[PDB]
Every structure is written in C-alpha cells, then in structure tokens.
C-alpha cells in the first residue's frame, strides 16, 4: 500500500522541508505532513495496477495484414509476411518506448478472420515463424512450409484463437527500445533501433490449396509482454509516429495551449 | 557542501558553488564482473592514463542560444589515450563523471538543464530520409534550434529535444541544473548503461549530454557578455577487449 | 568512380553526358 | 475420461487474461541476466520525478521554451493580478497533463494522492522576492485576489539561497479517487500565484526573472483503472 | 538470357529511373519513370536511405539465364550489393548496401516480389520469348 | 501457482509482484539530502 498520512500540528522552527534546491537533480520528498496541518489517514491504496507487469500485461495488436487464398501459383498476395517488430502500431510502441531497455516474454495471440465479396465451410491457416537466416517461402506452396525446425502453428476457424509463448530471444541482455548508433563500425549504414531488431519473420498462409471464390483472410497479431524487466525510463512519445523504422518526427507542441497564463476555465461565470 | 573537489587521474576539478553530485540511477561505475562478462580475452584497464578529466571545447552561452548536445563516448575519440584505446580495441566499457562548468556574476541569470540521456536516438529533420553521422557527432558540439529546421540533419527544434518528446520531461534521466544564482557547475556520475556487457565505442553512442537553457541567459549592459559553458568529462573504470589494428576514424 | 567516355560514347561513368555493360559503364 | 462442462467464456480472447500457453521455442536458453542501472518497476516511480510544467502554455508559445518560464518582474503595476493560475487537475489540465505525472496518469482513468508543485526561481542572485502560491479546493470559484487565495492551502515562498519552494497539493477530495478525465464530480481545484511582496533588484540586475514549475507525485499517489492514453493517435499505417 | 538494366539517379537533369530489357544481345523492352513501376519506387526510395549529400547513381542487373538469376547492383559504378535467394534479402558488405537493403525490406513484401521475379516470372517470360521468338 | 508447461516463458504474468525503489530516479544524488535540512 501507499504511504499513510501522518498527523502534523503547528510548526515554528528552522526546519524547512518546503525549501529545497531542484538544481541538485533531486526531487523533494515533501508530503502534506510537512507543509500543512494533516490528520492521520490510514491509506490502503496500492500501486498494483501501475507495475510494469500490469501496465504492459495487456495484449495489444502489433500487426494486421491480409492474404488471399486464390491467385496465380507464384502470387505473393496469397501469404503474409511480417518481419516481427513492435513499431507498427503506435499504442504498444509508445508503451514500450517509455523504457530504454526491456526484457520480457511475449504471449502472442492471433485473430484470423475472413473477408468475402459477391462455399468453403472453414479454412485452416499456417503461421510459420522463420528465425533470422532461415529459408523464406518463395510461393504459398513452397517447400519451406513443411517446417521441420521452424515453429509453426495451424489453426482452423471457429476454434479458439491461436496462442503461443515466446521467450526472451535477443542476443543482448535486453531488448533495446532505442539504439543511438549505427549498424557499421564506420558510423554509417542503418541508424537506430533497426540495427538491433533481429527477430525473425512471420509467414501466414491458407493451408487450403484453393477455393471456388476468392477469400481474403486477415490476421491480427496481439503481443502481450510478460515477465517484464524494464530499465532507464524515458519521456513518453510526444510527436506522432511517421515511420516504423526510425524516431523521425514532426515538431509537436509541448501541450495544448491556453489564451493567457491565468486562463483558468471556471464554472461559476 | 557547496564546495567539491574531484580527482581522477593527474587531473583535479575544484568547484566552490556547486549543487550535489548526481550518481546516475544511484549507481557508481564499476568494472565488469566475471559473472556478467562475455568477451573471454583479458581486458586492458589503463586506469590513470584514460580515466582522467578531459575538457571539451567550450561553447558560448547567449541570450538566445537554445542548447547543445554531445554524443559520448564518441566525442572522446582522439582525446588522449582514451581515444587511442577506443581506436585500437573492438569493445570498450566505462562510466563517466560529466562536470559541466558555467560561472557568471550575481547580476546574471539563467538556468540550464544538464542531462545525460541514455540512447538519445534522434530523428531526422526530413522525416523520410536519414542523416549522416556528422550531423550527430561533434570538435564543436551540435546545437539545438529554437524553431523546426529542415534537411538531412537532426530535427533540433529544442521543444522536442531531437527525440520527439517533451523537453521538460528530460528530468527522468540523470540530470542537474546550473542556476546562475545557485551554482556554477553540474556533476553527473553516470555508470555504464547498455543492454550488453561491452560495446563498440564508435558506432554506438551510449549517452548524449544535453545542455538546454530553460531560463534564457539575461544581464544588463556592463555585465560580462561572454559567458562560456565548458564540459569536462572523465571516463571511469574504463576497460577494453578485442585489441586489433587501430580504426581510422 | 568516374570514367573516360571512349568514343568510337561508351564505357563512361556517370550517366550524364541508354544502357550499361557488365562494367557498370554506360554507353549510347 | 474426466467429465467436463465448458462454462461461458470459453474459446474467447480476453486481452487481459493471464493464462499459461505452450512456448514456441521449448528449452530455449535465453541470454543471462545482466545488471542494468535504473530498473523501473512501477509507473509511479516515473510519476514521482519532477518534470518542468509548461505553465506559460499560451497560444504561439507551446513550441518554444517560453511555455515553461513563468515571468515575474519588478514593477508597481498589476501586482494585484495573479502571476499564473490553472486547474489543479493533473490528468486533463493542459498545464499539467503532458508532464511525467500527467503522462503516467493518462494511461489510467482514476488517480489519488498528493501533488507537489516545486517552483524554481531563475533570476539573479541579487533578486529578492516573496510569492504566495495557493491551492483552492473546488467548492467556490477561482480566487481573483490574493485575499481569496490566501484563504486556501497556500505557502509564502521567500526567494533566497534555497532557490526552490514546494507547494504540496494535499489531496482534499470527497472520494478516495478522482477521474483523470474532466468531470465536475471529481474536480480538484485551482493553483494560483500572487506577489506576496515583490521582486526587488539592484540597479544593475535584470528587472524580470523567470520561474520554473515542477510537478511530481507524493508517497501516497496511485493510479487505478488502466486505459489507453488519448495522447497517441495513429491516423493510418506507419512507414 | 533475359536481362534487365535498371538505372536511377538522385540528381537528374530535366528521367530519374529508366530500364532496358534485353534478350541476350538484343534489347526488346525500354521503361522510363516519366512514361517495373514497383521497382521504380523501390529504386527512388534507395536514395532516401543513403544519408549522404553527393549525387548517387543506382544500377541493377536483374535477369535469368537457362535457370540462373542474377540480382547484382552498383552504387556509383561500383558493385556494392547482391540478392541472396536463400535468405531472400539484398546483401552487401558496404554500409550503403545494408542501408538500401533495409530501406527496401521495410516494404515488407518487396523481398518476396524480388524473389518471385527472379525465380519464376523471369524464367517464365524468358521461355515464353524463346517460344514466341 | 501450478505450471502445466516445462518452459518458464510459458507461464502467466507476475501480477502479484509489487516492488519499487523510486530513490534511483528521485534521489540520485551522491550525498544524502535530509528533507528538513537545507538542500545546500
Ligand atoms: C510461431 C512462433 C512465433 C515466434 C514469434 C517470435 C516473437 C519475436 C520476439 C518479440 C520481439 C520483441 C522485441 C521488443 C523490442 C523492444 O523492446 O523495443
Ligand atoms: N567516491 C566514491 N563513491 C562511491 N559510491 C559507491 N562506490 C564508490 C567509490 O568507490 N568511490
């Protein structure tokens, strides 16, 4: 629980809890017991919802894309690729970039739905994870889909959504939400956190070979970080995101403006 | 407790009007331990030869200057044997004492936010392209801008401290202030902060030091118009692995 | 690189002076 | 085998459930834990840090540093007018909502606790001053004189060698929690500043100074319901 | 031996992108950016990733021979990157190679567009030309 | 508090864990600053 309020009476002394120096980089530890007369409040409020585990422990969509079931044999619209990353959706991106370094397990849940336009009873989908450097499928019916070590999940519609746990799979001791640096030692190449993003790709297709009419399935991937450790908090993203690859931003004002420094919207007009 | 004296190598810093010392995240730099090491070769630890106070080129605080930034440890290349050990080694790992100095009369006024930002990854002014490394690294440091600039360079509009955030929220990082009425120096002792035990001292900027005047410098005529801001930084517990032929940068 | 536009206009670089050879050098 | 009965809520994806699910990479040996300085375990640890409050967020100044500097000056006129005034409402007050305190809060629908507003005087070492920083619970309207403001929870800031003063907004509320968004039921009141005496300067010092305000949470501060922040919007697919 | 000779210029005098298709020693196809359109956008996106100032010229040699696919590229008349068919990624050692490779894989399926182009659509059209010519 | 899978990644989140050390962000100063005493 949070700290209780202690009773405080009238004071006339050389103690100065209200007088501090912010120049020290030190946030004052004053509570109302030091500036006013307080009563004893036995406070039972707890910060359970706040913790990083609860803050991030909500499954957020990270990837939406569709893929057809019918097409030319070599059609690339019949499967979806992701190139796993947490920068495509602004909400989970902003939540993860409030810490410089994070270390969590991923609880991945997919929501695959079918879109038709003017009779296949139910479709089966394969979500094949291709770790970095594995052979990527050229076509939907390519040999790679016969996953022999790539982890793959199969799912027929009408069932529960597919759901899998993923460990902490970075080569570093933590995921980097930010990487101020380059890919090459000569300080060129790729700048930023795309240098450290070496999570694999995600290939999704219909396992059904064909259909009388064209069907467009959409997959929505939902990430939920669990067993989270976070270091070095940062200011939350102020500006809207532009690219899913860098910190590029358009200059955004600090907060909403007023008309004057004493502009206080009051009801009792 | 206003006075403070730091001794690191053959260098001593004295300050008489200082705030406290900020120890970044309440941690004092240390050497990498055997449980957390990954590079197997023996590190080199040239303590006094590199863990000493290095003074960078000064900048002139003006009534309209919006701020400056330095990217470390890259700003310390060709800075004595520290820069030499950066060149000759593949990995390096160090904490730093960043002493920032700005003295002025009692008839001057102004306040700077001296903040160390770990992984201050910055955005380009033209948001679809990118910028070279010369637009990030220093010699003279890069300056923020009052307004939003364009070009293949960092978006230095100081309201978004190059990072697309609120500049007022930079106090979540190890920071102090130089209030010209209170202190004339800010000391930040930052440990080694990274997601890996060691890293390359060139292609990775572990932290950026930002000096941003939150209250502009002001003085009446007759007061000293030239008010410089000097950045003295000292690596601490520096060690290096993977010695090879020297880099050419 | 830069190349000398040998005239018999070919085997040059850059382009401003259209296809190129295995040399990556343009010619008209 | 075991006779089971599937109860309602089966085969559903509630995004807030914590269930065990099969790992995709069994027996994966993850990278050993390293000690990184600055581990944050609670968002209230971030909300407890001071952050400069853009009190001067008037029109045209919210893209400058002028948003942050509260102007105080040596002058006999408008000394009866408030130096600044805003709503003590860290969730939706434009002055406070974009600070670390307000940013952490918005991810939530309820808040509770005391807010400490620290004011740093950034004038000359030769400038002396006294300011009355007041907090008025929401019953009546905003104070329009220093007499109406001194009746509330206030502090007289004697500007001297300490350079900073703390006004602790002491959490006077009828309910245990307040809403982070605005509603009249959980209004938290007003913060006003007044010249107690004046800023007085020698013949050679600049006659106008700046004050910086800092907002942070106290020990009893906490946030409750978890909601998506209204600050981030994604109009379309990124690039 | 079907072959595409692609070129792009950061600084063109007023054709930023133009292609020449070849069957062995004879040129059959010509494409210009004013009048493959997905690789026109893929080539003009490459200059936004280079971070440098000076003018660049990007060339490509995409084609197939009876089936072998060549996916070579040159930055300023110097071959800097290749297409790796296995990984399905543009690959080089220079920093510019990785930069342009990453800018092109941001498109999230351009790698599969290139691999299908080299593996099936170039051999198909080569044999279709062999039959019809 | 029962785990039906052998991997530690395949557990639920640690929702009951409530711990914090706000001093590393609020009091990161070297010399201790007692509240009632002058900061300088
Ligand atoms: C079918 C198995 C699917 C396997 C999916 C692997 C998931 C990749 C791991 C998630 C990467 C998260 C990176 C976070 C980076 C950051 O913190 O900014
Ligand atoms: N001056 C100093 N302060 C510390 N704080 C923790 N360790 C140390 C140390 O070794 N030297």
């Amino acid at each position: 629980t949070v700290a209780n309020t202690q009773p405080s009476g009238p004071s006339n002394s050389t103690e100065i809890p209200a007088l501090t120096a912010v120049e020290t980089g030190h946030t004052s530890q004053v509570d109302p017991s030091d500036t006013i007369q307080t009563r004893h409040v036995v406070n039972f409020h707890s910060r359970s919802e706040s913790t990083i585990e609860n803050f991030m422990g909500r499954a957020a969509c990270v990837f939406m894309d569709q893929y057809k079931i019918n097409g030319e044999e070599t059609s690339t619209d019949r499967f979806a690729v992701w190139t796993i990353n947490i920068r495509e959706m602004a909400q989970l991106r902003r939540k993860c970039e409030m810490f410089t370094y994070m270390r969590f397990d991923i609880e991945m849940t997919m929501v695959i739905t079918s879109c038709q336009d003017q009779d296949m009873p139910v479709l089966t989908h394969q979500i094949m994870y291709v770790p970095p450097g594995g052979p990527i499928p050229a076509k939907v019916d390519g040999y790679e889909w016969q996953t022999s070590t790539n982890p793959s999940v199969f799912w027929t519609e009408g069932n529960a959504p597919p759901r899998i746990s993923i460990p902490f799979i970075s080569v570093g001791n933590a995921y980097s939400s930010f990487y101020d640096g380059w890919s090459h030692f000569t300080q060129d190449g790729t700048y930023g956190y795309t240098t450290l993003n070496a999570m694999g790709k995600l290939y999704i297709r219909h396992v059904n070979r064909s259909s009388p009419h064209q069907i467009t399935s959409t997959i929505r991937v939902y990430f939920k970080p669990k067993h989270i450790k976070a270091w070095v908090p940062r200011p939350p993203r102020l500006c809207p995101y532009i690219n899913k690859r860098d910190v590029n931003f358009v200059v955004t004002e600090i907060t909403d403006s007023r008309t004057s420094i004493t502009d206080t919207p009051h009801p009792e007009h | 407790d206003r006075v403070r004296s730091m001794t690191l190598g053959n260098s001593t810093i004295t300050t008489q009007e200082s705030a406290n010392v900020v120890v970044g995240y309440g941690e004092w730099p240390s050497y990498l331990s055997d449980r957390e090491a990954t590079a197997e070769d023996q590190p080199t630890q040239p303590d006094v030869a590199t863990c000493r106070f290095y003074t960078l080129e000064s900048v002139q605080w003006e009534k309209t200057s919006p701020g400056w930034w330095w990217k470390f440890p890259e700003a310390l290349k060709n800075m004595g044997l520290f820069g030499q050990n950066m060149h000759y080694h593949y990995l390096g790992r160090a904490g730093y004492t960043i002493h920032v100095q700005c003295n002025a009369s009692k008839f001057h006024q102004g306040c700077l936010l001296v903040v160390c930002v770990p992984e201050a990854e910055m955005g380009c002014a033209d948001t679809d392209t990118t910028f070279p490394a010369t637009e990030l690294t220093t010699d003279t440091p890069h300056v923020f801008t009052s307004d939003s600039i364009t070009g293949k360079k960092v978006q230095a509009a100081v309201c978004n401290a190059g990072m697309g955030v609120g500049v007022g929220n930079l106090t979540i990082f190890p920071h102090q202030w130089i209030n010209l009425r209170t202190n004339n120096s800010a000391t930040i002792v930052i440990p080694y902060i990274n997601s890996v035990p060691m890293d390359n001292m060139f292609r990775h900027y572990n932290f950026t030091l930002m000096i941003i005047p939150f209250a502009p410098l002001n003085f009446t005529d007759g007061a000293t118009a030239y008010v410089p801001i000097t950045v003295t930084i000292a690596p601490m517990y520096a060690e290096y692995n993977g010695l090879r032929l020297a880099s050419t940068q | 690189i830069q190349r000398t536009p040998k005239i018999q206009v070919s085997g040059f670089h850059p382009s401003d002076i259209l296809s190129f050879s295995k040399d990556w050098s343009f010619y008209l | 085998g075991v006779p089971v009965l599937n109860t309602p809520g089966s085969n559903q994806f509630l995004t807030s459930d914590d269930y065990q699910s099969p790992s995709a990479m069994p027996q994966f040996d993850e990278t050993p834990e390293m000690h990184i300085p600055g581990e944050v375990r609670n968002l209230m640890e971030i909300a407890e840090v001071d952050s400069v409050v853009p009190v001067n967020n008037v029109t045209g100044k919210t893209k400058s540093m002028d948003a942050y500097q509260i102007p105080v000056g040596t002058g006999n006129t408008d000394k009866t007018k408030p130096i600044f005034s805003f709503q003590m409402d860290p969730g939706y007050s434009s002055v406070l909502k974009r600070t670390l305190l307000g940013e952490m809060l918005n991810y939530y629908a309820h808040w509770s606790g005391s807010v400490k507003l620290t004011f740093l005087f950034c004038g000359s070492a030769m400038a002396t001053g006294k300011l009355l920083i007041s907090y008025s619970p929401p019953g009546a309207s905003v104070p329009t004189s220093r007499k109406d403001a001194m009746l509330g929870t206030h502090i007289v800031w004697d500007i001297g060698l300490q350079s900073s003063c703390v006004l602790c907004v002491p959490w006077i509320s009828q309910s245990h929690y307040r809403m982070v968004q605005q509603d009249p039921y959980t209004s938290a009141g007003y913060i006003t500043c007044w010249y107690q005496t004046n800023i007085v300067v020698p013949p050679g010092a600049p006659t106008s100074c700046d004050v910086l305000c800092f907002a942070s949470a106290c020990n009893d501060f906490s946030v409750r319901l978890l909601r998506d922040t209204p600050f981030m919007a994604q109009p379309g697919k990124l690039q | 031996s079907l072959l595409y000779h692609l070129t792009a210029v950061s600084s063109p005098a007023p054709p930023a992108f133009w292609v020449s298709g070849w069957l062995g020693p004879q040129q059959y196809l010509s494409y210009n950016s004013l009048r493959l359109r997905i690789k026109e956008k893929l080539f003009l996106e490459a200059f936004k990733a280079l971070g440098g100032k000076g003018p660049y010229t990007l060339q490509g040699l995409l084609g197939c021979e009876l089936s072998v696919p060549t996916a070579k590229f040159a930055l300023n008349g110097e071959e800097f990157m290749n297409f790796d068919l296995k990984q399905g990624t543009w690959g080089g050692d220079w920093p510019e190679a990785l930069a342009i490779s990453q800018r092109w894989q941001q498109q999230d399926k351009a790698a599969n567009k290139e691999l299908t182009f080299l593996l099936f659509s170039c051999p198909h059209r080569l044999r279709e030309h062999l039959e019809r010519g | 508090n029962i785990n039906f899978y052998k991997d530690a990644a395949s557990s639920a989140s640690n929702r009951q864990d409530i711990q914090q050390d706000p001093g590393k962000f609020t009091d990161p100063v070297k010399d201790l600053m007692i509240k009632t005493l002058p900061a300088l």
Side-chain angles (χ1 to χ4, degrees), chain A residues 1-71 73-208 210-267 269, chain B residues 1-16 18-138 140-249, chain C residues 1-3 5 7 9-21 23-28, chain D residues 1-77 79-239, chain E residues 1-34 36 38-39 42-52 54-64 66-85 87-106 109-130 133, chain F residues 1-5 7-40:
Chain A
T1 46
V2 303
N4 302 349
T5 314
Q6 299 299 309
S8 154
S11 304
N12 196 331
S13 58
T14 49
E15 309 178 321
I16 39 155
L19 286 177
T20 180
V22 306
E23 303 84 353
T24 54
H26 172 269
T27 300
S28 36
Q29 297 316 297
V30 194
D31 43 355
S33 323
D34 296 326
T35 50
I36 60 150
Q37 289 200 38
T38 57
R39 61 162 304 159
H40 187 43
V41 178
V42 174
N43 196 313
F44 298 111
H45 303 177
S46 176
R47 301 179 161 176
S48 57
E49 281 272 281
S50 282
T51 63
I52 307 309
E53 269 281 276
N54 292 262
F55 176 62
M56 308 291 303
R58 295 276 178 92
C61 164
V62 280
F63 175 64
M64 294 163 171
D65 203 16
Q66 56 244 46
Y67 48 98
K68 320 273 196 45
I69 185 163
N70 291 317
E73 213 248 358
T74 72
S75 207
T76 48
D77 302 339
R78 312 173 58 179
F79 56 93
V81 201
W82 180 16
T83 326
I84 301 171
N85 73 315
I86 51 142
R87 320 291 174 154
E88 305 198 21
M89 301 281 175
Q91 290 191 358
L92 187 49
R93 178 170 180 179
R94 191 197 205 254
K95 293 183 63 176
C96 262
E97 304 179 345
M98 277 160 38
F99 323 97
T100 308
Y101 309 114
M102 307 191 65
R103 177 181 175 113
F104 48 81
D105 309 309
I106 279 298
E107 194 209 63
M108 175 199 280
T109 322
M110 290 135 291
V111 171
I112 310 163
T113 61
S114 148
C115 184
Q116 298 161 3
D117 268 281
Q118 48 273 63
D119 191 339
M120 292 285 299
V122 69
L123 299 183
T124 313
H125 308 262
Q126 176 181 0
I127 301 100
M128 173 180 69
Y129 169 60
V130 192
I136 60 151
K139 316 158 314 181
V140 317
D141 43 303
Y143 80 88
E144 303 76 348
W145 303 96
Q146 48 108 348
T147 50
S148 82
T149 86
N150 288 352
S152 179
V153 68
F154 293 81
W155 175 86
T156 314
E157 316 174 322
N159 292 330
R163 153 92 66 78
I164 60 197
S165 272
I166 294 108
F168 167 70
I169 67 157
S170 180
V171 290
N173 296 77
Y175 294 124
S176 303
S177 299
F178 296 89
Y179 175 71
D180 199 18
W182 305 83
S183 49
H184 296 271
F185 302 93
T186 52
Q187 300 179 52
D188 39 5
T190 301
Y191 175 77
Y193 53 69
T194 37
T195 299
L196 308 200
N197 183 46
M199 331 308 147
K201 285 194 213 153
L202 209 65
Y203 275 80
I204 313 108
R205 66 150 176 181
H206 292 94
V207 175
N208 303 68
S210 183
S211 147
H213 56 286
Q214 175 72 279
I215 304 172
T216 307
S217 311
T218 301
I219 179 179
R220 295 166 147 85
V221 188
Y222 289 79
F223 270 10
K224 175 221 271 304
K226 43 184 195 175
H227 321 127
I228 310 148
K229 267 217 189 65
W231 301 269
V232 185
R234 322 174 59 82
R237 173 78 168 196
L238 181 72
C239 319
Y241 291 112
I242 301 263
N243 323 290
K244 69 157 187 285
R245 45 164 211 271
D246 43 43
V247 192
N248 291 19
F249 62 93
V250 174
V251 166
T252 293
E253 70 180 19
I254 285 145
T255 188
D256 301 339
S257 62
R258 290 195 282 177
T259 64
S260 100
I261 205 178
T262 55
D263 188 293
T264 317
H266 54 78
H269 64 268
Chain B
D1 63 351
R2 277 167 189 255
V3 305
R4 165 91 42 186
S5 158
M6 297 162 300
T7 297
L8 258 167
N10 52 348
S11 37
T12 319
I13 308 290
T14 41
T15 172
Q16 312 218 29
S18 85
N20 214 322
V21 176
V22 152
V23 193
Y25 297 111
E27 282 210 14
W28 194 268
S30 57
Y31 281 124
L32 184 57
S33 99
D34 306 336
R35 309 194 85 87
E36 313 216 308
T38 166
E40 299 180 355
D41 67 313
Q42 176 94 244
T44 180
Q45 300 160 338
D47 44 304
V48 284
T50 75
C51 317
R52 56 171 313 280
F53 272 107
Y54 295 106
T55 312
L56 317 180
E57 198 220 66
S58 267
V59 285
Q60 182 190 341
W61 194 359
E62 282 154 40
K63 293 191 179 179
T64 42
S65 65
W68 312 259
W69 83 75
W70 299 248
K71 286 198 172 299
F72 297 107
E74 211 274 345
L76 295 175
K77 61 168 277 207
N78 64 39
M79 195 70 76
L81 280 175
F82 184 81
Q84 292 303 335
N85 285 265
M86 281 177 46
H87 279 79
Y88 276 95
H89 283 93
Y90 161 52
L91 301 174
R93 181 199 144 102
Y96 309 88
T97 307
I98 306 101
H99 191 72
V100 173
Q101 305 125 189
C102 183
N103 66 83
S105 71
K106 294 190 188 306
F107 290 68
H108 288 75
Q109 68 189 25
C111 204
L112 308 153
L113 170 64
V114 181
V115 61
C116 279
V117 186
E119 313 277 6
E121 189 182 336
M122 292 169 162
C124 190
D126 312 350
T127 48
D128 61 344
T129 187
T130 166
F131 45 62
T134 38
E135 302 290 348
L136 298 159
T137 73
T138 78
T140 184
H142 287 278
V143 300
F144 290 103
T145 324
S146 43
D147 304 347
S148 159
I149 62 187
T150 166
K152 289 171 70 73
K153 33 150 66 191
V154 171
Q155 182 61 268
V158 69
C159 65
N160 302 131
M163 302 179 306
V165 293
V167 66
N169 300 352
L170 285 188
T171 66
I172 193 51
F173 300 118
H175 73 278
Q176 293 177 335
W177 298 82
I178 298 192
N179 207 3
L180 288 183
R181 62 168 285 116
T182 302
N183 55 336
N184 55 31
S185 67
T187 312
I188 294 157
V189 170
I190 191 72
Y192 179 76
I193 306 183
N194 205 347
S195 47
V196 283
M198 315 189 72
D199 205 347
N200 197 232
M201 311 279 267
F202 277 102
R203 72 166 172 186
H204 185 210
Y205 317 123
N206 286 87
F207 70 96
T208 296
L209 165 80
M210 307 186 173
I211 287 114
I212 303 167
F214 260 76
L217 174 68
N218 203 11
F219 52 92
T220 57
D221 289 312
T224 296
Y226 181 58
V227 177
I229 302 179
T230 313
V231 169
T232 302
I233 177 170
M236 283 195 304
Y237 294 91
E239 57 207 294
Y240 313 84
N241 294 273
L243 166 88
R244 38 139 190 74
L245 73 157
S247 276
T248 36
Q249 46 197 344
Chain C
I1 57 97
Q2 305 242 50
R3 206 134 299 193
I7 294 188
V9 292
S10 96
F12 58 97
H13 206 279
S15 35
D16 44 88
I17 201 186
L18 181 35
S19 152
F20 52 92
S21 325
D23 254 29
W24 306 108
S25 301
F26 309 84
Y27 57 64
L28 272 298
Chain D
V2 190
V4 291
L5 196 145
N6 297 266
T7 71
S10 309
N11 308 302
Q12 67 162 4
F13 173 30
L14 167 68
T15 64
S16 323
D17 55 15
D18 60 356
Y19 292 128
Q20 303 154 1
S21 40
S23 152
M25 323 170 178
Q27 291 307 124
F28 181 85
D29 174 66
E30 59 191 44
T31 326
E33 269 261 17
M34 200 193 57
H35 183 97
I36 316 195
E39 189 202 346
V40 48
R41 305 180 195 77
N42 209 279
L43 280 201
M44 287 301 99
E45 291 179 315
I46 312 169
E48 276 194 40
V49 181
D50 276 334
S51 191
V52 183
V53 176
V55 183
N56 194 50
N57 62 331
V58 313
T59 168
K61 290 195 177 313
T62 59
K63 291 230 208 71
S64 316
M65 308 291 301
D66 305 48
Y68 294 113
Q69 38 215 45
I70 305 157
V72 299
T74 80
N76 57 315
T77 311
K79 278 287 155 314
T80 43
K81 300 290 172 44
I83 290 180
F84 61 79
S85 89
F86 51 87
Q87 316 176 269
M88 170 38 61
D89 277 304
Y92 68 91
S93 193
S94 35
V95 178
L96 285 166
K97 68 178 177 190
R98 281 314 209 136
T99 57
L100 291 171
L101 178 61
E103 289 276 18
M104 296 316 102
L105 270 189
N106 281 250
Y107 275 107
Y108 296 88
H110 300 157
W111 71 279
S112 190
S114 314
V115 169
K116 35 175 186 278
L117 303 179
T118 300
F119 301 91
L120 163 76
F121 181 69
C122 324
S124 325
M126 295 304 296
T128 41
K130 276 155 186 291
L131 309 177
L132 189 137
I133 296 101
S134 173
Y135 164 55
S136 266
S141 182
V142 190
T144 45
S145 57
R146 192 184 68 191
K147 186 188 168 183
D148 299 276
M150 57 131 282
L151 293 174
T153 300
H154 72 272
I155 182 172
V156 174
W157 174 19
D158 182 47
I159 287 159
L161 282 163
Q162 280 320 298
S163 79
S164 318
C165 201
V166 198
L167 167 80
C168 202
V169 189
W171 182 256
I172 302 126
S173 151
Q174 94 269 43
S175 58
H176 278 248
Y177 287 83
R178 284 185 164 117
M179 309 299 290
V180 172
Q181 61 145 12
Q182 79 141 350
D183 67 326
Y185 185 61
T186 61
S187 282
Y190 311 100
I191 301 288
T192 53
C193 199
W194 310 82
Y195 283 102
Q196 184 70 1
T197 60
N198 193 2
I199 312 286
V200 190
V201 293
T207 56
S208 191
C209 314
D210 285 330
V211 178
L212 272 38
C213 174
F214 296 73
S216 39
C218 296
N219 268 16
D220 53 0
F221 202 104
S222 60
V223 294
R224 218 161 65 162
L225 203 41
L226 197 39
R227 74 161 159 80
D228 265 322
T229 176
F231 292 159
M232 201 86 276
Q234 174 166 1
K237 185 169 280 283
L238 285 195
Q239 295 164 266
Chain E
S1 163
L2 169 57
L3 229 59
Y4 286 90
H5 294 79
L6 300 94
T7 325
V9 278
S10 37
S11 43
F17 180 82
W18 73 96
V19 184
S20 291
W22 292 67
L23 311 100
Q26 277 203 6
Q27 191 247 0
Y28 82 107
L29 189 145
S30 150
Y31 175 96
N32 188 293
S33 46
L34 306 147
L36 290 171
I38 68 95
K39 305 159 157 325
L42 206 60
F43 265 56
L44 294 206
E45 195 93 343
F47 301 118
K48 296 160 193 167
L50 280 189
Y56 296 108
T57 304
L58 190 42
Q59 283 154 129
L61 256 170
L62 310 174
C64 70
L66 302 173
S67 198
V68 175
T70 58
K72 307 181 183 178
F73 291 98
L75 186 68
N76 285 335
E78 294 272 291
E79 190 180 282
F80 75 124
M81 83 177 162
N82 211 248
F83 193 85
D84 177 85
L85 293 184
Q87 256 68 223
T89 61
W90 298 264
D93 301 83
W94 300 6
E96 303 75 8
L98 179 71
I100 296 173
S101 148
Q102 287 275 115
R103 189 53 169 262
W104 285 0
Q105 310 171 145
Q106 290 276 272
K109 253 203 275 188
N112 282 94
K113 305 305 230 58
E114 183 86 312
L115 180 67
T116 67
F117 176 83
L118 299 147
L119 282 186
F120 322 107
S121 303
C122 264
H124 167 253
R125 274 181 331 221
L126 176 55
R127 297 204 201 88
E128 181 147 287
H129 274 152
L130 294 210
Chain F
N1 273 10
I2 308 192
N3 289 286
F4 313 110
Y5 305 86
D7 323 298
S10 170
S11 293
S13 314
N14 316 345
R15 312 280 211 152
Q16 309 265 348
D17 284 349
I18 189 170
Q19 186 173 355
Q20 60 206 282
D21 185 4
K24 57 179 67 184
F25 317 109
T26 44
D27 322 311
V29 291
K30 183 175 180 289
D31 299 321
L32 183 126
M33 294 174 56
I34 301 300
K35 167 171 48 176
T36 36
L37 279 173
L40 304 167

